[PDB]
Symmetry: C7
Subunit: 30 residues, 7 copies
Amino acid sequence: GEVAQAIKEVAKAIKEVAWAIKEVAQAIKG
Amino acid sequence: GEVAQAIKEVAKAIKEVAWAIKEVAQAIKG
Amino acid sequence: GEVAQAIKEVAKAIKEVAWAIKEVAQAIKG
Amino acid sequence: GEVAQAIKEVAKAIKEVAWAIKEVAQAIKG
Amino acid sequence: GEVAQAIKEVAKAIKEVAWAIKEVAQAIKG
Amino acid sequence: GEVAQAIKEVAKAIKEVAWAIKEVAQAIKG
Amino acid sequence: GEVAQAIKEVAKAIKEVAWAIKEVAQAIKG
């Protein structure tokens, strides 16, 4: 369904946030 | 539907947050 | 509809979060 | 409606996160 | 209703995030 | 209901994010 | 149901955000 699929897109985008934060940790480490 | 499309807007906004966090990582790396 | 409109407000607020994080990147670059 | 009003509260809370991130930016520029 | 109440719980949790971020700002000011 | 229960899981996860951000604050204070 | 399952996916993604922030904390501490 379209509402479920849209919520799945929100989940995917939040995973992108997690990855970007892992990039921040990596930057801090060098 | 209007609810699904609005939820898609949330996903896109969250992607913008991920990108902004990538810029923080790059700021730290520099 | 009221639910869709409210969800759009959530999207707009998340964009505000992205802009604030960019300020953090610029502060670091500072 | 109660669901729309609750979602608007989520939006309001996300605005507070944005303000808090602005405080982090100020602290860094500090 | 249970859905509206659950969404209010999300709003409250997000406020906790805003408070946590303020602690980061204060730590940086330290 | 399952939808309310899933939304409660989202609130629980957001609280975990708040705790992690407090951990960042301790690390900075460190 | 598909909507509840999608929301659970959002919850799981938010947990990934929390774990990533813990990596940021550990990076700062080290």
